[PDB]
Homo-oligomer: A and B are copies of this chain.
Amino acid sequence: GDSREKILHTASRLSQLQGYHATGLNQIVKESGAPKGSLYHFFPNGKEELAIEAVTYTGKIVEHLIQQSMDESSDPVEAIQLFIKKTASQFDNTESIKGIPVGLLASETALISEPLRTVCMKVFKSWEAVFARKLMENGFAEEEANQLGTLINSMIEGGIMLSLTNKDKTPLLLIAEQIPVLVR
């Protein structure tokens, strides 16, 4: 079902870029390049069902991107600053701006639909866990490691929102310059 993957990938791309409400089923069908396999693969549950898997899909890709930066350095603080710098590079070019992978959709559906909020909550944890695992590999206790995880994650999300609004990466670089003192 290459057509299933096209629809899912297309949904993930559009949800991160445009948000949940701004993205319609018509637009997902139009950009996927599939012949009505939408309701076939995401039957009478439609948008919310498709969005749920889209979030998980987006979640895994990001989760993987974070681990990669964590693997690129033995110094936990350096590995974290590098991830933030790579994320910030997307803004020095309006063309390469991806939006807010999971955060935008999550903030839009938090008060409507527990299923989406649940999945977004589950995905954010997976991301901070990547940060938590790396710190734990450096002496931090599980509880302390988990806290820096949610703190670092929250900061990056905030930096992305501001960098996107400002169409400039300064916010994110600013956050990067703080990792050392917070992790201390």
Contact = CB atoms under 8 A, between A and B. Distances in A.
Interface of A: 17-22, 94, 97, 99-100, 103-104, 106-108, 110-111, 117, 120-121, 124, 147, 150-151, 153-159, 161-162, 164-167, 170-171, 174-175, 178, 181-182, 184
Contacts of A20: 22
Complex copy number for this chain: 2
A51 B71 CA distance: 44
Given A22-B108, A151-B175, A124 B159 contact: no
Contacts of A150: 162, 170-171, 174
Contact of A174 (B99, B100, B151, B170): B151
B164 A106 contact: yes
